Amino acid sequence: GFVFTTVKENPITSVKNQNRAGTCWCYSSYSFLESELLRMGKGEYDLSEMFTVYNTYLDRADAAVRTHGDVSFSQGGSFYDALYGMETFGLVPEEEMRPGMMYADTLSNHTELSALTDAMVAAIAKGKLRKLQSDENNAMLWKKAVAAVHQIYLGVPPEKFTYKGKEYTPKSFFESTGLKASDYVSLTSYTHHPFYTQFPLEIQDNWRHGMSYNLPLDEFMEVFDNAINTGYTIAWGSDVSESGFTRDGVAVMPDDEKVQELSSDMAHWLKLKPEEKKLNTKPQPQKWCTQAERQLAYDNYETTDDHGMQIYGIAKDQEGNEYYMVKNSWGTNSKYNGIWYASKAFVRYKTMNIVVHKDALPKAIKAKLGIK
Amino acid sequence: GFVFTTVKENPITSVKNQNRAGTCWCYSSYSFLESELLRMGKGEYDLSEMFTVYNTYLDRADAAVRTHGDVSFSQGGSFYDALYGMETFGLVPEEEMRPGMMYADTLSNHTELSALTDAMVAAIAKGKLRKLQSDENNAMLWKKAVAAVHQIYLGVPPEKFTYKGKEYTPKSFFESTGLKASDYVSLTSYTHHPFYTQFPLEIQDNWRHGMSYNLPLDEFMEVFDNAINTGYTIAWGSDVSESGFTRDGVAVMPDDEKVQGSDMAHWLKLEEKKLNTKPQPQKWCTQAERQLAYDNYETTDDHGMQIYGIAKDQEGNEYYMVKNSWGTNSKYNGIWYASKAFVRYKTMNIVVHKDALPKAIKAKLGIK
Amino acid sequence: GFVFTTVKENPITSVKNQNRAGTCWCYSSYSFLESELLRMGKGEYDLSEMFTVYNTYLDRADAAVRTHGDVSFSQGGSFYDALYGMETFGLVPEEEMRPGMMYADTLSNHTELSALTDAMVAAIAKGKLRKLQSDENNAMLWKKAVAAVHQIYLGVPPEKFTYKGKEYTPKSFFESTGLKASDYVSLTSYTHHPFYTQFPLEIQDNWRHGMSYNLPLDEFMEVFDNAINTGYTIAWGSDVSESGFTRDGVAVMPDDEKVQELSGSDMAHWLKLKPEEKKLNTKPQPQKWCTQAERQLAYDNYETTDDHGMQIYGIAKDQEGNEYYMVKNSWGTNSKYNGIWYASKAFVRYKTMNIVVHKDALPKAIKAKLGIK
Amino acid sequence: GFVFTTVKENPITSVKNQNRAGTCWCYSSYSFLESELLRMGKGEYDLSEMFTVYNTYLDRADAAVRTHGDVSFSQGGSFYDALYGMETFGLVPEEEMRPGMMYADTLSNHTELSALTDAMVAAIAKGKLRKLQSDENNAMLWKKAVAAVHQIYLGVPPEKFTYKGKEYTPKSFFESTGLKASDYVSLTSYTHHPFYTQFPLEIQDNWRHGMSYNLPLDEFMEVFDNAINTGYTIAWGSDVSESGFTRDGVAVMPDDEKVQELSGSDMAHWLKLKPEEKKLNTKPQPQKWCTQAERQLAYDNYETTDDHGMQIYGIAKDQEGNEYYMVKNSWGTNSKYNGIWYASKAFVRYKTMNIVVHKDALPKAIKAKLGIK
Amino acid sequence: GFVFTTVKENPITSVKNQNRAGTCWCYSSYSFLESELLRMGKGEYDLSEMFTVYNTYLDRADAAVRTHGDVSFSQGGSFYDALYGMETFGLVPEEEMRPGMMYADTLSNHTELSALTDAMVAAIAKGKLRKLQSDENNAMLWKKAVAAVHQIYLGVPPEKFTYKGKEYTPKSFFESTGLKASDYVSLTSYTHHPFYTQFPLEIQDNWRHGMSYNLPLDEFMEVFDNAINTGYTIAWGSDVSESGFTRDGVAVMPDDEKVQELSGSDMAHWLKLKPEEKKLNTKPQPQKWCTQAERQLAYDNYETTDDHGMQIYGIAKDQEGNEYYMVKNSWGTNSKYNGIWYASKAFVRYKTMNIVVHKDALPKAIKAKLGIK
């Protein structure tokens, strides 16, 4: 089995549960922003994902209609959706818009909401309508309909609310946190664009076309360690549709060839049970990908924008392999109570993009990117 | 051409315009009920079709979901939808829910509303959802969604309103009119059910399964003349997808063989035959010929109108005076002249007041 | 009828014919770039649209696959596709890749090419494949397949060629022209984004997400006249799906109410009248001058769409003094004005999606508000 | 368990692996033709299936387009595809076109190739195109596209190559083998056509409409034994979608009623016993010996379909004396008998679609009834 | 206009009317066979197309099911369907199974029949059924269903009937005519197969895969004249989806370029004329004479398809001396020439798919090249 030893970890809030909704982009973004508020001495917060999820879906519906269905309308999103959201829509506390409150639950189940809203947006964006209807103030009626249905399943967004004795608006509550979207940068590492430049990742949930700074793979991984070692956390967008990512709290990238030599020869090893191979159950030699191997997986669909999480610490196993400590959003009913251990080889290979505070960047990388 | 002379006509209200919506079932029903209020001495009314159209669509959406998509969800309806509606939802005046007020118009355009609501109802009724969501009061969330979207395109139904100095609710306003749904009967004429019995017509817009009394074709047509001659009007549901039904205010059933100076080989390769422009010999259908057209899709539940009078042409042919709901931009300002032969052949069903029925027919149907 | 008188127009090349392909974005871009070369004293050029169209489709196929089918794969494009293309792929003269040369024609017919490549891109982008195949050099095989099929219908791109005695590559030929993509800016006018900022237009053929500067409508229209009056031309991307845009060389925006008032007919007889008798698009009529909000509504409700790309190169007036922009289309010369269109300023104000001009065509005050040095 | 003893078997080449491609028709045909070359004293050969697979798919795409989609375009084929192929295209050694060489593999994976080419052929054969494009030499452009995509995934067919010191073309290399397609006949056994006549089997992969001689079922089975006993092998096209065809190297046709009686349990208790305790396909059991009508019903009601192509090369017996045919499969050697299957004579009698043998493998009397010299 | 003068014509029966059914293949085949019976001194016959149509559709449904939907199930057919039909099913006179008798008509309207049977065959051939049901005699139940529905719309086929005082069966009535399918050959002219060989045309309605002899185009046309001049008629399967094939009884192949050269207008004045003004199909014009390659291109690129079946029975000339073939159509007599068409020799040379003639209609030299006794 695995025996992990924490090397360094930074403060995080409690593990949340997105339940039956594709809102990991918002839950991980808020785990990140809440750790940012803790680091900035602002205290512990519990931000409402349903508020940002609600406003993001309305903008995504508008994008689908403007592009006549090219922008897909689904539940996913990005870290930039939350950074854009707090500046544009603001923030509200968790108590003002809880998950499941409209259908007598305490956890999200957006299957019916999507079934209706996907059908509505498609009837407009991909239909035969030549002129969409509007009221005397040139307000579109279909936007009212999509907003009305979203409010029925997610709740009504508060215009004013009281939090710890003071009255706020979503905008004024965001201002009280002191957060600035300009303090955060998105980073990635690919070769189909020149290094040290900005490009929008060609993924479906990046329909806002948010930019990311492009770094070489080795410098990309240094930002991870530099952020954790200097007290920062990382918003981690990664591929999790791999055999190494298990339900038992670990994400590893084992070298299948090296494990076969330490065992049975190559012929007998290839007919040993998965329980007998122990590829994802014990510390194994990791495969350290090159920049080209990382690019191939992104080109050939083996690395997709699957899941958003938060990296907040570094740990080691009994054999000395290094891991990143990951805060998931699937509740606490797992081996490590909602915490995952992702090996550095896995993160190097399957990371789509990350968001960190600017001051988490090493001085040399800041200069190469032109960030003051 | 045609030269029509009114033989008798009964009071009607102004010609309305359903415009770009399949809501003729409600517009013709209200033309009928407004003539009924005039006949009963209640004065002139302008009832809101959009109020009943709104509530009918919510019930039709529920019917589609309960039957998992068997009941089709579309814009059409029946005279019974209005009779059931006034008893269940009530009535409001036209001013309280006008057509097009939500998209800066004065006439209906429900194409976008249908595009949205058809997609929503289908996602529930014909989708893969195994458990529909509900709130703490067991109210369905999808019904809230479908109702909210209808209100955005049709308007909010009034809970209270003031009409001619008095405050009303939709229910109390209906009660002030004195209308009773039990005073009205639906009549049809087909042979796939026994005569003088009741059966629900097997048509898509009769999803409420309203009953109709079955009469022989000759006795069926006697109700038409007796109703007009005793001062009543008729809610007329008929097939209008015929070559004889023209946009120029006439509906005729000409005998193609009898009209044929051109030989048969020249006639079958000839608008030039002046078939719908002058008085022609009519095809007087038998009961079996009427039944075949209903069985083979040639007679379908197309359109709802109001018959309010009888007229003659220059040659003495009898016509029924029809009040359509397509506005007044036609040859007779929204009025149609339907020959008795056309009505005999293409009528789906009619609704009249009980007292418009002859006494002998009333007894055969068992109507007190 | 119409009688037009040129007020001022700037030099253009011959009218081209895109024929049966949705490549107006490239033909108008090159009509624009060729006028830029004439203005810069470089002479007359005939740049190959098929070269840029070929390389653009390979990038669009890649965009469709990376976004798993979100980016639609179709024939359209944008002015930025050509501006990006000349910097990335270069330029070749018309003779090196002519339209229709592969199927024994002289004009484009890309219907069969699209039928195949649309089916190919969809099989990859929207299929069930879990791992796309690659060779020993990590090159994707599907990109080789899509590139090979495009070459069979469009031709092989030249690596080297000789033009007027000198040997070139596509890159070195572009460098010999002196064109710079940084000299050109995209402009638009909408209110769903703040004025004097940059945003990518939310249209399907802008899959590269090229930015456009947002201007108020009146300052936006000032760029048109200042560009023409100072000797520049305009790459004009506009909606042409209007009743006022006719096949007879005019694009007008008539006020239906004012024309109805100045005729004996009333509202009832007019709404059931013969369009030949309304003379709405056949003689000078009072124009409908849209507000900023009316322009925004048409873009919001699908009445203003990214339909067609053309070139504005002059200003003209009719017999009544109404001003028009002179438009060079790419539908050949078999029209009333030999491939030239006259679009009234009211039509351009209402139906323009975006334009591309040289930076120096901007008035100095507008340059300052946009932060363009 | 099963214990097999060879009665007679004829020389075969090594077991191949078709991997993730529906190319069993070509791998079995080449196992058959290679045994023919050994029998004819020509030595051991390793013919390239990918060469014949490449050329066959181009002909199948042409057939699909000519019939506007009636001929399905899929990976399958028939023994006649290979016999026709060697006469028309020729033969090349394995080294000149290996499987997987284009996507850095050593075994075939044609899933992506099919995804593209199925989409391309359907866009032409089942689309709305009214006139397909052609070049100056009347060569169809879509055929160029389908060929180019196949070469990207399968490799370039060699025009010339050197094999064991001699230079060949695909045609001249085929001529050096001495093989003749006229030496081989297709045989089947059905009643919806008269016996001792020729008819093309009404199966999808027989889009070339190759003929088969129709024999009574008993005389059909006599050809099997006579071919093996006189030193010939058989190209065996058969249904393998049966419970009796197992992954453990056996293909049996057990009589469910007799096996139930042979166990102590009655009809009720037997029908609620687990399959491990049923032992239907794990030990020798009484076989179901079908009639001609029972064989016809299974072909008529979809229970016998053209699933798989293999090679029968020997006869074996089990511990109880039951006779089996020794089958060379093309799924590699990672099975109980290293890629070899044992198919009981009852299974072969029941589930055989058709066979191909050399003319001289036919008994003289059967050869006379068919009119074969 | 056209003024035609008959050069020679052979006896034919009355013009029939297929009405709303795709049964031209059977009506033209029986017009052909009836002229053969007149030529052989057997008298005039009126054979029932609905009898052969009924039995052909049952076989085509079986073909669709056996090929799991590859063979399309539609109303069309071929001349070989009737030649095969009379040998297999026999012949009955028109009176025993008339068109429309089942739905109170006198002419065919098979739209509803097709709607039902297309859905039935597709539910079997392209469905998910793994085992089709059969009765105690191994007869397929779906074949009973498809046959029952065909009888409801077409009528019950007679087992016995009385004709001119004698009682017949469908088989014995066919024998009384003396017709032999072996007396007739199918001919075509294409280059994707070797000349003077037999191949089945790759067309959807040739699902029986009937063979045709391949002739060079010039020798192919010699059979036309030799058959007519020696007293025979021709079963003519041709493409009729051309601008030259008009509803006014003519089928021409005018050279658009050559007519403009003899026209008074220039190239620019001609390409801007009204169709009625450019008199392409209304007056005798110079014809376009195709090469063998041009004929092949039209078959390859979908411009020549197996559209219509007719009968050629004579040769005629126009006022200017151009040669035409006299064609007996099956669209009734309500046309300019009462159901007769005049097809120029250039049209027949270009748009003919295949023909069927009696063996003795072939020239002696051509008969020898094909190896026909």
Ligand SMILES: *CC(=O)[C@H](CCCNC(=N)N)NC(=O)CN
């Ligand atoms: C991690 C998560 O919950 C969402 C799931 C979205 C699923 N949507 C579709 N498959 N169409 N993932 C993301 O938001 C990734 N950015």
Ligand SMILES: *CC(=O)[C@H](CCCNC(=N)N)NC(=O)CN
């Ligand atoms: C009254 C009216 O106009 C409708 C037309 C709409 C029909 N559309 C559909 N059924 N989908 N006709 C009726 O309501 C017939 N009673």
Ligand SMILES: *CC(=O)[C@H](CCCNC(=N)N)NC(=O)CN
């Ligand atoms: C004007 C032109 O040729 C293209 C046509 C695009 C057609 N697109 C589709 N049929 N899906 N228009 C543009 O490129 C506009 N940017």
Ligand SMILES: *CC(=O)[C@H](CCCNC(=N)N)NC(=O)CN
């Ligand atoms: C045995 C083999 O590899 C092929 C598989 C063809 C599968 N085809 C489709 N799923 N469409 N089988 C044959 O070639 C049978 N003759």
Ligand SMILES: *CC(=O)[C@H](CCCNC(=N)N)NC(=O)CN
């Ligand atoms: C000439 C004729 O009647 C048929 C047309 C039927 C074809 N219809 C469809 N394929 N849907 N033509 C032929 O039979 C030519 N073989």
Ligand SMILES: [K+]
């Ligand atoms: K929270």
Ligand SMILES: [K+]
């Ligand atoms: K993955």
Ligand SMILES: [K+]
């Ligand atoms: K009203």
Ligand SMILES: [K+]
């Ligand atoms: K009708």
Ligand SMILES: [K+]
């Ligand atoms: K050019």
Ligand SMILES: [K+]
């Ligand atoms: K438009």
Ligand SMILES: [K+]
């Ligand atoms: K091999």
Ligand SMILES: [K+]
């Ligand atoms: K089977």
Ligand SMILES: [K+]
């Ligand atoms: K006949």
Ligand SMILES: [K+]
């Ligand atoms: K044609």
